[PDB]
Amino acid sequence: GSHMSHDGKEEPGIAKKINSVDDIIIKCQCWVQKNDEERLAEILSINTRKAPPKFYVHYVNYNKRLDEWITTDRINLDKEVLYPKLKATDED
């Protein structure tokens, strides 16, 4: 199905639900289980030197001193994932 898809005045930010930690980047944001709770953590880096691998998350709600290296089992794949926006721009 297709229809008239206009633009108008929309904002950035893409919300998509994934099921694989492999599709994660530094600009990717997901939820992390901490203290029997869920907190929105933003990815900072990736470390694929283990099995499963490890990832660097940073609690946006807290300071950068809270960030750490969590594992797949520490990632919440039940909540929608936030990805960066891309647009063709040829400026200087």
Side-chain angles (χ1 to χ4, degrees):
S2 318
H3 303 99
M4 293 185 295
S5 310
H6 301 145
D7 294 272
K9 270 211 154 169
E10 73 195 33
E11 262 43 47
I14 306 92
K16 77 181 70 265
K17 255 190 269 267
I18 64 174
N19 274 113
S20 320
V21 305
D22 177 55
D23 276 293
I24 297 173
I25 53 166
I26 296 85
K27 285 93 167 285
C28 166
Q29 300 166 84
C30 55
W31 285 84
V32 188
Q33 173 157 50
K34 223 62 167 193
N35 190 61
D36 210 56
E37 278 195 17
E38 259 154 355
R39 302 202 86 70
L40 193 87
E42 171 171 27
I43 304 293
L44 283 180
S45 230
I46 305 169
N47 172 34
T48 58
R49 277 283 207 164
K50 224 76 96 258
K54 279 179 160 177
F55 301 78
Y56 204 48
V57 288
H58 160 44
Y59 297 93
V60 178
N61 306 281
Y62 295 121
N63 289 275
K64 192 148 154 156
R65 61 211 296 180
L66 262 301
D67 65 353
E68 55 172 79
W69 300 82
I70 59 164
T71 29
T72 66
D73 280 22
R74 290 206 173 279
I75 301 159
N76 301 52
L77 282 177
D78 202 47
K79 272 80 169 150
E80 304 173 283
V81 177
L82 257 291
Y83 286 92
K85 177 139 195 64
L86 301 165
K87 184 88 78 164
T89 327
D90 188 61
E91 283 196 42
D92 165 60

